[PDB]
Symmetry: C3
Subunit: 173 residues, 3 copies
């Protein structure tokens, strides 16, 4: 029938208008989402141990897990963010327009700057500060290059996931 | 209770005979599967923005995500393919008897050679062409070694053949 | 309404007292867990092809998959173990007080020693023997350092102890 929505320690999720929640999504406790968000199949927004704040027009893709460290870390996601399939976001701040590649893990006290890209499968170490409009890739996630301003977010994403950009020398997704 | 099956843009999943769908699997939109397939716990096949085509005796293991790019990529998976636990396949072509290792990410316009093996946890970048009968590994995935065609088509077929037996213990209540 | 729990070939899950099973967890076949365990959202314990044995006060976090190889590998998980979000455990032994970091893959015949830690996102190759009180990281996962045995056990104990408290907020 509908997404699993659930109170914990008296906190009840607050979801804005025009938000799509998949039938088998889970949103639990201290979670606020803005307007125009989508939460896809089997995604889990677990606000049991600390707070999750999500802005407007955020896409949380299938099988993604959002969690925090009890009294140590929080999630703040800004507007127009894309969180890829099977991503783990743990106690991270993600600024407006940032894209997190499918399969990535983003650890606590990470800041992803406005319009930055985390490549698919990256592991972003605790406390990593990702500059606005940069691409990070690998395990651990390292600076690859500035986002090309002459191209769109999506094409910058596609270029960041092409083997041509990591050829014979650079060994990071 | 059974699998979440839904249409999107009027496309309705089509499933061959003798196909196991776990009751918490999700199959949505433009998905076509052959017969002898198995779709495991919390697998998601999301054909909402482009097409997913799957041959026979394919297992999609627990927590695996199949998705595509709007007007840009499609998924084509051959027969006797094993897709591991928590794998993401995005707009890729997987030929017969290929095995995708658990936790791997396979990106758009990738072609996985017949009898090939993507190692657990690999990230295969866009327009990687994986040689048949070869093992790829790492992030980005790179050529590690050849396997004999004999042991590699047979070996990957046996994983897919046993998976049909594991499916029937749930599907047929055996 | 509640967790998917099912027999396969006559093997029926056995769950200890005081154990939290999330409404969308899956526990199937030859699985035994002890007391004070928590299985979180969309976790899958698939005991269809071989045994899964889990001791007391173990948390299996959201999205994690536990499976085996038919006739070939088993899962044995000791007491006070924390298994991170979106982890895959395939046919591995995890000893008391061990942590598996989120996003990690742990393959068949791996042994994770008492009080050892697998870093987030590691891939532990088939057969890797992880020393007690050691940190392994990377893909393939490699030795990083020793940790003090008494500190590692008490820290990892307190992570498993907090998880039992988080579980009690959902009961
Ligand atoms: Zn967590
Ligand atoms: Zn996608
Ligand atoms: Zn398996």
């Amino acid at each position: 029938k509908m997404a699993l929505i659930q109170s914990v320690r008296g906190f009840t999720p607050i979801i804005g208008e025009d938000t799509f929640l998949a039938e088998n999504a889970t949103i639990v406790g201290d979670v606020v989402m803005g307007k125009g968000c989508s939460v896809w199949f089997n995604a889990v927004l677990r606000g049991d141990v600390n707070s999750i704040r999500i802005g407007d027009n955020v896409n949380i893709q299938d099988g993604s897990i959002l969690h925090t460290l009890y009294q140590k870390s929080t999630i703040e996601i800004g507007d127009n963010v894309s969180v890829g399939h099977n991503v783990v976001i743990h106690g991270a701040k993600i600024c407006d327009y940032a894209l997190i590649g499918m399969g990535a893990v983003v650890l606590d006290h990470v800041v992803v700057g406005e319009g930055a890209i985390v490549a698919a499968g990256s592991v972003v170490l605790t406390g990593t500060q990702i500059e606005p409009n940069s691409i990070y890739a690998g395990a651990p996630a390292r600076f690859i290059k500035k986002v090309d301003p002459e191209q769109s977010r999506e094409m910058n994403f596609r270029i960041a996931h092409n083997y041509r950009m990591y050829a014979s020398w650079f060994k990071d997704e």
